[PDB]
Design a binder for these strands. Sequence first.
DNA 1: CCGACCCGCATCAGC
DNA 2: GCTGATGCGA
DNA 3: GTCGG
Length: 326
Amino acid sequence: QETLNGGITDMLTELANFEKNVSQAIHKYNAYRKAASVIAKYPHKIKSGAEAKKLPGVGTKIAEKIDEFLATGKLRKLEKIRQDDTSSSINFLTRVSGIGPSAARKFVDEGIKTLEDLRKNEDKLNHHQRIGLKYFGDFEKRIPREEMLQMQDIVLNEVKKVDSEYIATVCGSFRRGAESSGDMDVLLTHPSFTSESQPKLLHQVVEQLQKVHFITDTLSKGETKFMGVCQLPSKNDEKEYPHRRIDIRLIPKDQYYCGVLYFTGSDIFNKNMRAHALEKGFTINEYTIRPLGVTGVAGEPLPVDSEKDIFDYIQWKYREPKDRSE
DNA sequence: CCGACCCGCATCAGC
DNA sequence: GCTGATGCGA
DNA sequence: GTCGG
Ligand code: NA
Ligand code: NA
Ligand code: NA
């Protein structure tokens, strides 16, 4: 029920997960999600599939499943997937970070189906999957904004202790003011790092955060992207905080604010802004805004030294992150 | 009728 | 050893 | 799965 249509939204999200994890049909997965997002925003209790079909992203098949769900309170197809041992095991194992549909299938094919089975077969797991297994429960917890604020202060301070010239921004829905987050997404830059130009810039920051024991584990790390695990320090007497997922991305200074814009979102806000930028003769991606010639040929990137600059180019009043829900 | 639907890093396949 | 494909994660 | 060239 939720905000009028949670049963339908829950059903669509479950169908999405089966498409992604078991059938390996990622476009169907995203079709079901989009339909769930549209419906979640529809401010009426839907009464028929035909009503739902009017909404963009709902077609004949989702309408039919909505009719069945309304008439009966259930979907047959979803009921049989639920009791299928292979589908439910594949679905479950993909909850481990680093285990996607392919690894989940091979594990289930070899009788590895549960966390206990994984705990028993560690040598069959790569490094990422072992870390995802170790923190299985913590990684499914949301992060309250209160903790994200603290996490933000540590990153910004540690970054400044390495080099005062680093610029670091915590983006994601947290930057839009969200009351919880699923992970922490940090965008980093330094004036010595441009698209046309000093080494170890990402490494130095990751190392600092490891030294003070904020970053506890590494999932992947190269010269421009780090994915890992972090944890707030304990009060010495209170319960330990859960381990959290954190990504850090090093971006060229001249592309920084286009990245900050992109990764702050929302996704709906980004599609809308790109769509408006096109109808003004501009193309914006996660790195640049460039003017379009009369035949549609993208010209050279325009200078960008703030988020505002981007809004100025396309004749749009600046909108605070708080106001970028769409 | 039928193709679109948006890359960094770890690891495998193959050479 | 290397190059390119694949899986994965957001 | 849904949309649209
Ligand atoms: Na529709
Ligand atoms: Na997974
Ligand atoms: Na998953």
